[PDB]
Design a protein around this ligand. Sequence first.
Ligand SMILES: CNC(=O)c1cn(C)c2ccccc12
Ligand SMILES: [Zn+2]
Length: 140
Amino acid sequence: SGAIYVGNYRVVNRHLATHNDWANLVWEDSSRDLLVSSTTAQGCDTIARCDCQTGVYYCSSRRKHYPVSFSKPSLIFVEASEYYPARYQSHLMLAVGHSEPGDCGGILRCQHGVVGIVSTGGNGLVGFADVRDLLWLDEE
Ligand SMILES: CNC(=O)c1cn(C)c2ccccc12
Ligand SMILES: [Zn+2]
């Protein structure tokens, strides 16, 4: 689990979105595993605007933050899971690291702020859904 709270937006894994999230929908993309919903109280997170490939992510299943190198947000094939069929996920970044399904929502952060959230993984690899192209998250 986990979310990004950027102003009056809540950014979660589409596959973990609640009824309240869907009842307050701002934007969703199955191809990106992202859903954004509206909030009433403002959040304590800032979004990175950058092309950093190094950062730190939170891994719930180790209670540990790990420094990682990660790929550029790309269109990449992801093996079938409980939540999606074998498909290409868009705006995705891969790192070498530990990840389990419930680690989804863990933040990846760089010097510029929040890069993305844990989404995909397997075989000692962790995948993060990028949010840095979502400029509209920063306004209105
Ligand atoms: C759609 N979410 C998932 O199913 C997964 C997310 N992470 C990080 C995994 C790691 C190993 C295996 C499956 C997943
Ligand atoms: Zn950065």
